């Protein structure tokens, strides 16, 4: 399975990124409600998302597609705004994360 | 200050679509928080941003570089997460706005030129 340029990119730039920042480690499995005493977690949000799962199907190659994995992205940071309080510090954190996404989708190479 | 490939596709292709979106009056001009009734707007949000603004922006040559212009749309997307409630029409809105905005990113042509 050949890989396309964008979701080489995705995993060896993007996702190398984020998954060690220090800001990461709220992201990197999926959120447990129970360990954090959220019972209306999964109330509000229906799509959870998280690092591990977007990084395990870039090594999988689950994705046809870059905007695929970069909607993943974006729902798990989407998650976090519209759960959280506004000056909670998670909301900070995906919004400084976020920063870096978008400043490296921005040089991503192009499709086909 | 610049006009750049990328910029240009950001100004003519990727706003020119999001402006016209049926869910896009919202977002085209500021938040009026008097108007709308919504006294803790601004105590809530520090950073208001709009279409309107952005469009601006690019016809001024306000930005340097692609990346500065998709930081001001994803502050105005989150924007209305951090504010509005789950349950708001708006934030649907906004959710399928963005959706569109990342997937013509994904299309930017790569030549960050000019």
Not at 13 to 36: E, G, S
């Amino acid at each position: 399975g050949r890989v396309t340029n964008q979701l080489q990119y995705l995993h060896k730039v993007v996702m190398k990124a984020l998954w060690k920042h220090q800001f990461a480690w709220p992201f990197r499995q999926p959120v447990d409600a129970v360990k954090l005493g959220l019972p209306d977690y999964h109330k509000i949000i229906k799509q959870p998302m998280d690092m591990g799962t977007i990084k395990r199907r870039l090594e999988n190659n689950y994705y046809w597609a870059a905007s695929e994995c970069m909607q993943d992205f974006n729902t798990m940071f989407t998650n976090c705004y519209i759960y959280n309080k506004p000056t909670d510090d998670i909301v900070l954190m995906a919004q400084t994360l976020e920063k870096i996404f978008l400043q490296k989708v921005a040089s991503m190479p192009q499709e086909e």
